[PDB]
Design an enzyme around this catalytic site. Sequence first.
Site, PDB file in Angstrom:
ATOM      1  N   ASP A 290      74.640  45.967 -50.186  1.00 32.65           N
ATOM      2  CA  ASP A 290      74.751  47.402 -49.964  1.00 32.65           C
ATOM      3  C   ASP A 290      74.796  48.155 -51.301  1.00 32.65           C
ATOM      4  OD1 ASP A 290      76.769  47.010 -46.931  1.00 32.65           O
ATOM      5  OD2 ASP A 290      74.631  47.052 -47.133  1.00 32.65           O
ATOM      6  N   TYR A 374      76.634  50.210 -40.771  1.00 31.71           N
ATOM      7  CA  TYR A 374      77.949  50.032 -41.399  1.00 31.71           C
ATOM      8  C   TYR A 374      78.456  51.322 -42.014  1.00 31.71           C
TER       9      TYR A 374
HETATM   10  C1  11R Z   1      71.288  47.337 -44.425  1.00 28.73           C
HETATM   11  N1  11R Z   1      71.202  47.570 -42.987  1.00 28.73           N
HETATM   12  C2  11R Z   1      71.761  46.574 -42.074  1.00 28.73           C
HETATM   13  C3  11R Z   1      70.571  48.725 -42.494  1.00 28.73           C
HETATM   14  C4  11R Z   1      70.430  48.934 -41.113  1.00 28.73           C
HETATM   15  C5  11R Z   1      69.797  50.088 -40.650  1.00 28.73           C
HETATM   16  C6  11R Z   1      69.310  51.035 -41.538  1.00 28.73           C
HETATM   17  C7  11R Z   1      69.441  50.834 -42.903  1.00 28.73           C
HETATM   18  O1  11R Z   1      68.963  51.771 -43.790  1.00 28.73           O
HETATM   19  C8  11R Z   1      69.865  52.407 -44.698  1.00 28.73           C
HETATM   20  C9  11R Z   1      70.226  53.795 -44.185  1.00 28.73           C
HETATM   21  C10 11R Z   1      71.177  54.502 -45.143  1.00 28.73           C
HETATM   22  C11 11R Z   1      71.350  55.970 -44.768  1.00 28.73           C
HETATM   23  C12 11R Z   1      72.541  56.193 -43.839  1.00 28.73           C
HETATM   24  C13 11R Z   1      73.233  57.519 -44.163  1.00 28.73           C
HETATM   25  C14 11R Z   1      73.439  58.347 -42.899  1.00 28.73           C
HETATM   26  C15 11R Z   1      72.146  59.041 -42.481  1.00 28.73           C
HETATM   27  C16 11R Z   1      72.422  60.092 -41.414  1.00 28.73           C
HETATM   28  C17 11R Z   1      71.141  60.822 -41.011  1.00 28.73           C
HETATM   29  C18 11R Z   1      70.859  62.050 -41.877  1.00 28.73           C
HETATM   30  C19 11R Z   1      70.536  63.253 -41.015  1.00 28.73           C
HETATM   31  C20 11R Z   1      69.239  63.796 -40.987  1.00 28.73           C
HETATM   32  C21 11R Z   1      68.899  64.917 -40.200  1.00 28.73           C
HETATM   33  N2  11R Z   1      69.817  65.525 -39.427  1.00 28.73           N
HETATM   34 RU1  11R Z   1      69.539  67.181 -38.193  1.00 28.73          RU
HETATM   35  N3  11R Z   1      71.560  66.838 -37.839  1.00 28.73           N
HETATM   36  C22 11R Z   1      72.384  67.523 -37.031  1.00 28.73           C
HETATM   37  C23 11R Z   1      73.735  67.139 -36.914  1.00 28.73           C
HETATM   38  C24 11R Z   1      74.274  66.046 -37.619  1.00 28.73           C
HETATM   39  C25 11R Z   1      73.453  65.307 -38.464  1.00 28.73           C
HETATM   40  C26 11R Z   1      73.835  64.196 -39.231  1.00 28.73           C
HETATM   41  C27 11R Z   1      72.929  63.507 -40.064  1.00 28.73           C
HETATM   42  C28 11R Z   1      71.585  63.893 -40.177  1.00 28.73           C
HETATM   43  C29 11R Z   1      71.124  65.046 -39.402  1.00 28.73           C
HETATM   44  C30 11R Z   1      72.061  65.751 -38.544  1.00 28.73           C
HETATM   45  N4  11R Z   1      69.297  68.844 -36.995  1.00 28.73           N
HETATM   46  C31 11R Z   1      69.240  70.101 -37.456  1.00 28.73           C
HETATM   47  C32 11R Z   1      69.074  71.159 -36.560  1.00 28.73           C
HETATM   48  C33 11R Z   1      68.970  70.913 -35.189  1.00 28.73           C
HETATM   49  C34 11R Z   1      69.029  69.607 -34.709  1.00 28.73           C
HETATM   50  C35 11R Z   1      69.195  68.570 -35.624  1.00 28.73           C
HETATM   51  C36 11R Z   1      69.281  67.111 -35.295  1.00 28.73           C
HETATM   52  C37 11R Z   1      69.194  66.590 -33.913  1.00 28.73           C
HETATM   53  C38 11R Z   1      69.278  65.276 -33.759  1.00 28.73           C
HETATM   54  C39 11R Z   1      69.452  64.470 -34.964  1.00 28.73           C
HETATM   55  C40 11R Z   1      69.525  65.068 -36.160  1.00 28.73           C
HETATM   56  N5  11R Z   1      69.442  66.334 -36.291  1.00 28.73           N
HETATM   57  N6  11R Z   1      67.543  67.517 -38.577  1.00 28.73           N
HETATM   58  C41 11R Z   1      66.555  67.176 -37.739  1.00 28.73           C
HETATM   59  C42 11R Z   1      65.232  67.445 -38.090  1.00 28.73           C
HETATM   60  C43 11R Z   1      64.939  68.067 -39.305  1.00 28.73           C
HETATM   61  C44 11R Z   1      65.969  68.421 -40.175  1.00 28.73           C
HETATM   62  C45 11R Z   1      67.283  68.139 -39.801  1.00 28.73           C
HETATM   63  C46 11R Z   1      68.519  68.442 -40.596  1.00 28.73           C
HETATM   64  C47 11R Z   1      68.469  69.100 -41.920  1.00 28.73           C
HETATM   65  C48 11R Z   1      69.627  69.316 -42.528  1.00 28.73           C
HETATM   66  C49 11R Z   1      70.838  68.886 -41.834  1.00 28.73           C
HETATM   67  C50 11R Z   1      70.748  68.299 -40.632  1.00 28.73           C
HETATM   68  N7  11R Z   1      69.627  68.095 -40.058  1.00 28.73           N
HETATM   69  C51 11R Z   1      70.062  49.683 -43.378  1.00 28.73           C
END
Ligand code: 11R
EC number: 1.4.3.21
Lengths: 620, 620
Positions: A290, A374
């Site tokens: 990680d 995780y």
């Molecule tokens: C090693 N291993 C086993 C493993 C296994 C699997 C995967 C992996 O890879 C490594 C991954 C490491 C990254 C993990 C860090 C966490 C990432 C979280 C995702 C990031 C994210 C990316 C995008 N968005 Ru959206 N959003 C809304 C509420 C809460 C959110 C929390 C997180 C959002 C997000 C949210 N959003 C904005 C407006 C209206 C709806 C939504 C939605 C709906 C449903 C999901 C997400 N969102 N969002 C969607 C589309 C475009 C833009 C956007 C944005 C922009 C800014 C903020 C939030 N959102 C490794």
Amino acid sequence: ASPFRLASAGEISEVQGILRTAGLLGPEKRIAYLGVLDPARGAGSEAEDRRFRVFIHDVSGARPQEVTVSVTNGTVISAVELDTAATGELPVLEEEFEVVEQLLATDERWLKALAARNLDVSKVRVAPLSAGVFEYAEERGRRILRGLAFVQDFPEDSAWAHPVDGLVAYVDVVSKEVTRVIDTGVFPVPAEHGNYTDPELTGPLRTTQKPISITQPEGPSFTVTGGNHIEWEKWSLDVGFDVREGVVLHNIAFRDGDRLRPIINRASIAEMVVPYGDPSPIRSWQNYFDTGEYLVGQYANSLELGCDCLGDITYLSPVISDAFGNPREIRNGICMHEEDWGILAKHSDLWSGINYTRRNRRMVISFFTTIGNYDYGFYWYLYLDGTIEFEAKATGVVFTSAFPEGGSDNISQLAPGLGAPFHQHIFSARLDMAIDGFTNRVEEEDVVRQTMGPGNERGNAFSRKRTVLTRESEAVREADARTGRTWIISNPESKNRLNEPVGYKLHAHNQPTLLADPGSSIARRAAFATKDLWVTRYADDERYPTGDFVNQHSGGAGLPSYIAQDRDIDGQDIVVWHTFGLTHFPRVEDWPIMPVDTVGFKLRPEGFFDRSPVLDVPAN
Amino acid sequence: ASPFRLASAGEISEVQGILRTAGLLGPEKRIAYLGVLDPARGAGSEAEDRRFRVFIHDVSGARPQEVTVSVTNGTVISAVELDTAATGELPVLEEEFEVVEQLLATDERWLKALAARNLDVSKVRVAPLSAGVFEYAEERGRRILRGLAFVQDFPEDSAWAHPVDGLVAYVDVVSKEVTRVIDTGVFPVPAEHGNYTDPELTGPLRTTQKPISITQPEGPSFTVTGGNHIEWEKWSLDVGFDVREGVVLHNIAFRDGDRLRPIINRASIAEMVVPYGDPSPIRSWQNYFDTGEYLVGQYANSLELGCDCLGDITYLSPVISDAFGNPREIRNGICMHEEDWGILAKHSDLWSGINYTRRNRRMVISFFTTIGNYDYGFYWYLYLDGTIEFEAKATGVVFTSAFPEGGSDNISQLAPGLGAPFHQHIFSARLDMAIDGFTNRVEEEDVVRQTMGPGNERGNAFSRKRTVLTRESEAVREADARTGRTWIISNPESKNRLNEPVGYKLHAHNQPTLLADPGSSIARRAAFATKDLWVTRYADDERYPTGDFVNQHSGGAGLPSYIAQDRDIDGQDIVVWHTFGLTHFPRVEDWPIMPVDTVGFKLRPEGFFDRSPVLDVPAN
Ligand code: 11R
Ligand code: 11R
Ligand SMILES: [Cu+2]
Ligand SMILES: [Cu+2]
Ligand code: NA
Ligand code: NA
């Protein structure tokens, strides 16, 4: 003014500008890693030079570069092209996460596999998983990710409930090609949802929890100056942040009377690895570094008040580089607060009539990161009595598989048809020691049992022994819980008032170390994880127990290479590397979201002070 | 109405009256122990019978008695004369503490010893120390205490700073005779004071600690009914108190949906011993069974708010018998409160977009006791997630000696001329298990490493094994930290929804066990302390790992005698006895009053529940 201050948005934009000006950051370039370098030994005398280390990837297929920039002077100090087949691939880029699923979605082999299982491709999530180094010759020198599939029934569904076992794919994320699709046969995709916010599963939420209010009406007892310099209850330190390691502590020292006494020069979690113990070919390659492969700092959560961090909280908001060299703030990414820690010292004396009670406290510096399924909290604690402790809190959602018909010796059952492969989470703490300064040594201390006989006629005596680790060849040590084994770091040139070298004692938890066969790929790539304690002579380029480039990198670098130098560590500038981990056989209670479990270590003063350091703590 | 309610002042006065009426408590009689007996198995159906067990000493030299009284019915159930040379002496009486010093003060041998050292007898304190069983034939059947001397320069002086080494005396506290005075030679009496409230030593008190306020504006989330029945966050239990064991937990159960599921029937610290590792004849006999010989409950502190117990505290004030059978209240002797315990579960999901955080809490039930120089806190914790934990906090003033010229393999130096002999503090937790009821079994679980080869071609697999302990002869177990050894208590007749027996896993700290030679007196008297885990078949008279009468009692009773019965423990009413301790090589930081150090154990649910039990915990 501090050379240990956090990187500012301006510094990062300036690195970008310097790289651009130098011809090193054109439109095909991406920053895979960027961090400030610590000052050189003895740099305090000279004027400051803020230097940054950068790993630059090229999306057109050109060789990546390692570059050091002086942001103070606006110069490139050095730039070297990397041969990744030799020294390792760069860390996984955030922008590559989506690529595995995207490429697989139009691959005929992948589609055939999904169709055999009656799965809608639009609902199939693919985790972008580090590849490691196995038997596939074509992968050498290529940036590969492996993909495991999980079905998401609807946008807010937890895909982890629905693993697609018997299927794995390998993808070249630069050339954008699917190299292999392996289908060993269909397994039932577990059908129960794992939606821990769905009222059907939670039932009625508890109404029985009454509020707990923790306040500090006069504010906290610690000060923050220069952005990240903390002073609290005799302690002095600087809170750094690096996109790879996360929170890094610098210059941990304790003010004993008039003297600021160093204890630890630098403390970090320099690696963490999650090896899986399922021999299925679908997951037997799975080992997630990680820290080294993904960069845990990059994914630090923004921490919400009264939710993640409770009490009177002071936040730091560290700045990191995006893929293009633009600064990005992790708002409220580091929590700092003090908390009550029960009774510190207590005695009610039958002869003097004096009754005495004092309370303890600790300073807490923490962050929380998310790596796919995780989520880990990293906590450093400083206590009134001089104790230093680290604790990791592991939570999130367990990595799943099918549960085989007829059971498994390597997977536990969580729900009908749903499995969780056995695994470990193993950390390496790198402690650049400075006990009363840099001239240090390490002793291994064991309890010594004594035989009834002359000099011990009642058979009650017991003792202990200390063995100095004189050279690096002798400094790769294992736990021995039965004999109460610990390790003392002392300064042989600094004595306390009783004429004994001042020291600190490391108390380990003595949890199992890496379980994999010693001839495995992971035993070589995570060699550090096979032994509890290593001691090296300090060197500026010996930063991680796995070397600089862990992704798809074989053995050859890291701790085993460092200790081959067999350097003197008896009264020298030394570094302790402590391996500690959790061995996880998932339980039904871990599903659908896992309660925190913990592991860690601590160091306690051992004749460092001339008497208790907390006699001046006031009553009440 | 609960048969598990605390003893009331009225019940104790009634026992006194019943004993008096029966001719068993005349003016020469003293109560050395009095406690309520737990209800018999299957007693719930029948009407209650509150019974009390009493050990009665006779100051005129007559044989003591063990008596059982029914306070409900006003009767003596049984009364038997004890032969103490065979079965052991009664616990030390509080009234005997002063006697050692008093008798020694007019003894010519003692006075000669003090005069040789130029010590004023009026300033010499003598600790009333348990004698154990050694080579002195005249002590068999006699109540002996041994005396070690400490100089008190003035009324508020800490005498522990001024041990008088080379001198020990033995005293018959019934006949009031000094049997032996041993003077092996003068040692310098250390001169530095250890007065931790003297400004000369503390220096100016800190003014840097700002207040931490912990409040519950709507009160606590737990209820107390029937005096001592606690309900908190699905947990149900009764908080008992016994003058020997201290706080005892009864009927620990968890409400899972509609069903109240038992987990532990009775949990206590049934013994604790402090063996010393100094072969000097002045202290080589020293082993303090704080629980068995002194009765830790008797010396429970009255705990002050905002000092000993912080937050919204609910107190219990247990009642005990004085030496004459009159009730005495220990005001605010038991603290009960809930506290925040950081993050419980957390996940931020990259596919669902759901971010989820929940906080943990624990219920805390504690007391603090003082035994001469030592002060111990006993803490039981219940967590939201089903975890049960015990923690002991050791503080007070270290037991001192002279520090020998030329050093010592068995004593550390604290101050000029001042030594602290090495020792251990070893606890026995008696857990009368009731996992989903009384039909239980114990398995020992070890991690299993696997060899690279067929079925494991990459050398990554690892597994585990469980071995059922079927009979008591097979149930004396040792730790193996290297293999991650734990012990699972399960109910083979109660399965979870995945068709696996429900269970709880005991996680030990794997600290060293008793270090003394196996042929020593202490290895026999504290045989329990030589092994980490014992399992017995439940029996009403098998209460303590050392038997009923520990004072001056050889081996012959306790755990080794119980397991010789070789009873079936595979799906039966069983009791787990876990040995755990601290091995203490005192440090300069422990002087002049020691910062708390800790040891303990925990049990976590292991397929007890059908999924996480904390899905219904609300946000924020
Ligand atoms: C090693 N291993 C086993 C493993 C296994 C699997 C995967 C992996 O890879 C490594 C991954 C490491 C990254 C993990 C860090 C966490 C990432 C979280 C995702 C990031 C994210 C990316 C995008 N968005 Ru959206 N959003 C809304 C509420 C809460 C959110 C929390 C997180 C959002 C997000 C949210 N959003 C904005 C407006 C209206 C709806 C939504 C939605 C709906 C449903 C999901 C997400 N969102 N969002 C969607 C589309 C475009 C833009 C956007 C944005 C922009 C800014 C903020 C939030 N959102 C490794
Ligand atoms: C196993 N091992 C290694 C070991 C090693 C050594 C000993 C030992 O033995 C086992 C001992 C177990 C018992 C330990 C429990 C703690 C005992 C504490 C002493 C009890 C006590 C007994 C008596 N007194 Ru008092 N007094 C005042 C403040 C605070 C006090 C705290 C405690 C007092 C006390 C106080 N007093 C009242 C009024 C004015 C002054 C005083 C003073 C001055 C100096 C000392 C004590 N007091 N007092 C003195 C005289 C008569 C009555 C009396 C009372 C009565 C009621 C309350 C307080 N005092 C075992
Ligand atoms: Cu895990
Ligand atoms: Cu101790
Ligand atoms: Na160092
Ligand atoms: Na039982």
